[PDB]
Amino acid sequence: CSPGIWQLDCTHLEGKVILVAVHVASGYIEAEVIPAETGQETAYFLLKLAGRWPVKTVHTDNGSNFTSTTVKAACWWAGIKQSMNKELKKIIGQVRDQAEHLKTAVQMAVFIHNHKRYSAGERIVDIIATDI
Numbered sequence: 001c002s003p004g005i006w007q008l009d010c011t012h013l014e015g016k017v018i019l020v021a022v023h024v025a026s027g028y029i030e031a032e033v034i035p036a037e038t039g040q041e042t043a044y045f046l047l048k049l050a051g052r053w054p055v056k057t058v059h060t061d062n063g064s065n066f067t068s069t070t071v072k073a074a075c076w077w078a079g080i081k082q083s084m085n086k087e088l089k090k091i092i093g094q095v096r097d098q099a100e101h102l103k104t105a106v107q108m109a110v111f112i113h114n115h116k117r118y119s120a121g122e123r124i125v126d127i128i129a130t131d132i
């Protein structure tokens with residue numbers, strides 16, 4: 001699909017919130033454990049994401065995620081416009097006993113996902129370089 005398209009969703013595990021961004025064309029994932037499903041957290045995550053990748057458009061499965069003034073401010077400033085979550089919960093479960101904190105097991109799972117086999121990590125850089 002278009003190389004600027006991302007999907008963002010918030011999942012739940014162990015009483016905490018995981019925000020999951022998927023680069024649609026590639027399957028590459030960037031995830032983070034957040035204190036609460038708040039618009040401040042979504043806005044901050046979108047500023048970080050957009051500084052690292054050319055984010056053009058963002059989709060979500062919960063449109064109310066994007067209603068806060070603060071999320072709209074982040075999209076305004078960065079020039080943003082408007083399944084993989086169970087493959088990620090699968091990998092998290094496999095490595096969970098190897099980390100104390102869930103946040104650590106999440107980043108391990110992102111690592112495993114992105115480098116598994118090309119890999120999602122390799123596809124996203126190919127797709128984006130080719131576009132340039």
Ligand SMILES: Cc1nc2c(cc(C)n2Cc2cnn(C)c2)c(-c2ccc(Cl)cc2)c1[C@H](OC(C)(C)C)C(=O)O
Nearest residue numbers: 095096097098099100101102103104105106107108111
């Ligand atoms: C809380 C913690 N303490 C750790 C490690 C490793 C070590 C020696 N210590 C100190 C320790 C634990 N027990 N003893 C007998 C000593 C780790 C860790 C580092 C790299 C990976 Cl890949 C996975 C875990 C984490 C990890 O947290 C971090 C990533 C630091 C926020 C986690 O959440 O487990």
